[PDB]
C-alpha cells in the first residue's frame with residue numbers, strides 16, 4: 001500500500017524546509033543551513049556523510065523519492081526513540097519536559113517556515129491529550145507514531 005494524500009502533503013512540506021531554492025534537490029549546503037538553524041555546526045565532511053547515507057542514486061543530492069524512502073521506515077525498534085528523543089529536545093528549549101506553543105513557533109521560524117496563529121493552535125491542540133495546553137514527551141512520541 002501507500003500513504004494517503006495528506007500524508008504525502010506533509011512529507012513534501014517538510015522536504016521543502018530543506019530545499020531552500022525549491023529546485024527539487026537537497027544539497028549539503030542546504031542541509032548545513034538547516035543544521036546551523038538548529039544551533040548545531042557540522043563540517044562539509046560530516047554533511048556529505050549524512051547525505052551519502054540516503055543518496056540512493058549517488059549524485060550528491062537528495063530528492064523527494066529518496067527523502068520518502070528514508071522516512072517511511074525507522075527500520076529499527078531500537079534507536080528510533082534516540083532520534084525522537086533528540087527531536088523533542090530541539091523543541092523543548094528549556095528542558096522542562098513540556099513543549100509550548102511559543103517554543104514550537106520559535107523553532108519552526110528559525111527554519112524559514114513562518115506559521116499562523118491558527119496553524120500553531122492546531123498543531124498543539126491535536127497533540128495535547130492531558131489538556132494542559134502543552135506537549136510533553138509522551139504526547140510527542142505518540143504523535144510521531
Ligand SMILES: CCCCOc1ccc([C@@H](C)NCCCNCCC(c2ccccc2)c2ccccc2)cc1OCCCC
Nearest residue numbers: 010011014071072073074104123124126127135143144145
Ligand atoms: C517530519 C516529517 C513528517 C514525519 O513525521 C510525522 C508527522 C505526523 C504524523 C501523523 C501520523 N501525526 C500527526 C498528524 C499531522 N498533524 C501535524 C503534526 C505537527 C506537530 C504535532 C505535534 C507537535 C508539533 C507539530 C507536525 C507537522 C510537521 C512536522 C512534524 C509535526 C506522522 C509522522 O510520522 C511519519 C514518519 C514515517 C513513519
Ligand SMILES: [Ca+2]
Nearest residue numbers: 019021023025
Ligand atoms: Ca535545493
Ligand SMILES: [Ca+2]
Nearest residue numbers: 055057059061
Ligand atoms: Ca540522490
Ligand SMILES: [Ca+2]
Nearest residue numbers: 092094098099
Ligand atoms: Ca519547554
Ligand SMILES: [Ca+2]
Nearest residue numbers: 129130132134
Ligand atoms: Ca499536554
